[PDB]
Amino acid sequence: SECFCPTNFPSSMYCDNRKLKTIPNIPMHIQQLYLQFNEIEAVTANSFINATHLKEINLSHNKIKSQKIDYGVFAKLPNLLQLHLEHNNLEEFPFPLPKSLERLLLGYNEISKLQTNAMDGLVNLTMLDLCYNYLHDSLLKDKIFAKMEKLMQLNLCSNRLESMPPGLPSSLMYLSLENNSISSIPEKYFDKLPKLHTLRMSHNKLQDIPYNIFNLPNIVELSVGHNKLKQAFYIPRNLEHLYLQNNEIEKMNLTVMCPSIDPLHYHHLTYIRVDQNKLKEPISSYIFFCFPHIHTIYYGEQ
Ligand SMILES: *[C@@H]1O[C@H](CO)[C@@H](O)[C@H](O)[C@H]1NC(C)=O
Ligand SMILES: *[C@@H]1O[C@H](CO)[C@@H](O)[C@H](O)[C@H]1NC(C)=O
Ligand SMILES: *[C@@H]1O[C@H](CO)[C@@H](O)[C@H](O)[C@H]1NC(C)=O
Ligand SMILES: *[C@@H]1O[C@H](CO)[C@@H](O)[C@H](O)[C@H]1NC(C)=O
């Protein structure tokens, strides 16, 4: 009676936006369970005991605390693929979790603790969202993501990181580190991240980055706005979108951006954003000969 189970979508149960204080008893045939936007504090075993076929649980926008999640409640679900726990009051990374897990969303919590080996076995994880938490470098230093060899997307934005996370898996394609306090990137950091397509590092403290740190063969989006960069750098062939707003750039040195034109493979660059730098004039018109696909250069004010 508290939830709605449509007869035409019989494996789905909607318990969302109902001011629920507790998770109701879940029938055994339920595969998609929506409990978001409630006032739930605890996740107890008694609610899930027969619900062995759960593939997706949304518990986002609740008041769940780490200490009120019963041991094993998620881990005993052998087909759980997706777990949403964003917008809760979690202080630590939840464990144990089932190894079937593919997508785990933990954004907007208070995660400041991450137990040694908490990520082990999550070898099927493709998406991990930890944005808006309290992570700091010591939690990540032992290469904790390294065995997640299917991980495609890692969101670590709006945390308390001072360094680039070490030993990220080589599968990774999307890395967000926006709104941390990262100031350098170590020399060969990207050597074992050849699949990186999207790198978001806006709102950090980047300044004296290595020459050709961003010479990345599969990068498509590079977002380094609101940092302290003084110079342009070599644009890699694959890049399409470049976000450089709100840095300390006096001139975009076109020769550094493009030292040679190869007319058999033109660079893919399509979009540059450079507003709120210290540029006196537009970039040299010769940019269009190295980057023939440029459709927009946003200058705003400087
Ligand atoms: C779940 O089913 C078991 C039988 O495997 C039963 O003992 C238990 O009481 C049931 N739980 C419910 C209806 O919540
Ligand atoms: C991971 O995914 C594949 C199917 O894509 C499956 O065969 C394998 O059993 C899964 N591993 C775990 C530990 O759930
Ligand atoms: C940075 O993160 C803090 C919390 O860590 C948040 O309040 C702030 O808005 C964030 N800034 C941006 C630009 O996202
Ligand atoms: C471009 O960069 C090179 C090396 O940093 C330098 O020799 C040259 O003067 C620069 N050209 C400009 C700023 O127009």
Author numbering: 64 to 365
List passages from the publication reporting this PDB structure.
SLRPs comprise an important family of proteins, divided into five subclasses, that influence collagen fibril formation. Recently, our group has demonstrated that Osteomodulin (OMD), a member of class II SLRPs, regulates the diameter and shape of collagen fibrils. In conclusion, we found that OMD binds to type-I collagen driven by weak electrostatic forces involving the residues Glu284 and Glu303 of a conspicuously, negatively charged patch of the protein. The weak nature of these interactions and the fast association and dissociation rates suggest that OMD shuttles on and off the growing collagen fibril in a fast-equilibrium.
Because SLRPs, and DCN in particular, have been described generally as dimeric proteins we first investigated the oligomeric state of OMD in solution by size-exclusion chromatography with multi-angle light scattering (SEC-MALS). Contrary to our expectations, the data indicated that the molecular weight of OMD was 54.7 kDa, a value consistent with a monomeric conformation in solution. To address this question, we determined the X-ray crystal structure of OMD at 2.17 Å resolution. The structure showed the typical curved solenoid fold characteristic of SLRPs displaying a large concave and convex surfaces. Despite the high concentration employed to crystalize the protein, OMD was found to be a monomer also in the crystalline state as demonstrated by the lack of stabilizing interactions and the small area of contact with neighboring protein chains in the crystal, as calculated with the PISA server. The structure of OMD was superimposed into the structure of DCN. The value of RMSD (calculated for the main chain alpha-carbons) was 1.3 Å, demonstrating that their overall fold was very similar. The difference in the dimerization propensity is explained by the lack of key intermolecular protein–protein interactions between neighboring units caused by variations in their amino acid sequence. OMD is an acidic (negatively charged) protein with a pI of 5.2, whereas collagen is a basic (positively charged) protein with a pI of 9. Considering that the main driving force of binding was electrostatic in nature (see above), we mapped the electrostatic surface of OMD in the crystal structure searching for negatively charged patches that could contribute to binding. We note that residues E284 and E303 located on the concave side near the C-terminal region of OMD are critical for binding, whereas the region near the N-terminal end do not seem to critically contribute to collagen binding as suggested from mutations L144W and Q145A.
